[model samples]
Target: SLQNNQPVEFNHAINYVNKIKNRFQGQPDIYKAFLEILHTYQKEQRNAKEAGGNYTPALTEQEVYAQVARLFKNQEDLLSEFGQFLPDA
Candidate 1:
């Protein structure tokens, strides 16, 4: 099982996500979406390690999904409005 390496694995995942943040520069909505996901992971890590190793971090699927949903909506709107105008779909 991964019980022992969970924390380390989570740490690495957060590091990778942070590294990708700069790639979203110049896109405020996308940047915000990435930040939301990053924050969720950080919160989970903090909770898991706090309170005498309470190790219980509730799922943030709703929060993460809300951010991504907004991002997806914006993308869909862009496609619907300009897709035909562009050279490709």
Candidate 2:
């Protein structure tokens, strides 16, 4: 049920991402970007269940910036920098 040519399981795939987030020692900017995308996708997954549409959601143009903009935190110092177990880039 794990690894190699076997079909990838959902929890397993997510677990590995968690592992990457866990085992990664630094490079927090990249991790922040990584998590933003995952969270948006997860929300889309939920809303699809709400409307019975696509199984997953995707980002729009503005939405992409909303995620990518985190990396641009110095722009106006406009956004609140906070963390749910997140840290400096």
Candidate 3:
């Protein structure tokens, strides 16, 4: 939940990811690639959450994914991609 302590948790995660990126700064392309994958992972999680639960403040997961997938092919693979990003996975 992003209400009580989610923001701090999110920030911590971001910091950890940034540390990894910083450690690999010598390979700029690799950092960029990692970031791209991370973004994809995030997108899929959001989509799945909406698909199974609330979609958005304005739309459902189905509505958003239909349009989002048009912009990013293979978006249907988002949930699995997100799972790959899971800390415990």
Candidate 4:
């Protein structure tokens, strides 16, 4: 049954992300972005069940946008510095 408490699963996923972070260190910024998106999606799935919906902790467009935006700021900074890794042409 898919009736298990969702917060538990969500937290588990979060923990897994942390583990993966420790295991692989080449792309923290990218992982951060992906983690936030996963979190927002999980929350949305949870919320969908609130109003006669068939899911729990579902994401809303606004919530997803907010979370993604929060993480994207870091990515943008990284991207802006991309040229630093290149040599003069």
Candidate 5:
């Protein structure tokens, strides 16, 4: 894939994904929720692209937070780390 330098940083969005990984040591539920919802979201993006129509809108902060909410459902430290970024902080 032709990715940009931005993703190479690993401290960018990639790091955040890894952040969740290291935060939870032994919880498969957290892992499952992350990907089940994640792939669903990604699939939507992929699905829309397959339509050969207009480009899809960028993902919203609120939309992203919703995924976090589900993941947060299974995170204590995860939620605390994300507390400030949580909705209605």
Candidate 6:
């Protein structure tokens, strides 16, 4: 059973992510990106709590574009194929 506003255990999300991260075989890039996103999200949440304000950490359009450029530094086709799987900022 679940209840509204239920307090979750500490590190619950991190633990859950770690447990399921290995399912993506031969997709280590995506896995790393997912983990990075998860860690950043946690940091944002903590920042909001500590500051007593809403914290929405996000990358600007240029930043996303820059990363895509870096990801496809030498292989544009690869980015086209896996870009859909890339974590959005």
The TM-scores, one per candidate, come to 0.40, 0.32, 0.40, 0.31, 0.53, 0.33
Predicted structure 4: lDDT: 0.52
Winning model by TM-score? 5
Clashes of each: 0, 0, 0, 14, 0, 0
Best by lDDT: 5
Worst 10 residues of 6 by lDDT: 80-89
Q: What's model 3's TM-score?
A: 0.40
Q: Once model 3 is optimally superposed onto the true structure by TM-score, how far is the C-alpha of residue 34 displaced, in angstroms?
A: 1.0
Off by over 4 Å in 6: 1-23, 52-89
List the RMSD of every prediction in angstroms: 11.3, 10.7, 10.1, 12.4, 4.8, 8.7
Q: List the residue pairs that clash in candidate 6.
A: none
Predictions in order: lDDT: 0.53, 0.50, 0.50, 0.52, 0.61, 0.50
Which ranges of candidate 1 are over 4 A from the true structure? 1-26, 55-59, 76-89
Candidate 6 local distance difference test against the native: 0.50
Model 1 scores worst on lDDT over the 10 consecutive residues at 80-89
Best of the two (1, 5) by lDDT: 5
lDDT for position 49 in model 1 = 79
lDDT of candidate 6 over 8-66, digit per residue (tens): 54355444445335444455775576555445655666777777776665543334434
lDDT of 1 by residue, 48-70 (tens): 87766857776465555455446
**Candidate 4 residue 26 C-alpha distance from true site, Å:** 5.6
Q: Which whole-number lDDT from 0 to 100 does residue 70 have in model 2? A: 55
Per-residue lDDT of model 4, residues 1-89, tens digit only = 58666586567555655644654468677567656765766666667766677655535545544554454454554323322322221
Give the lDDT of residue 74 in candidate 3: 34
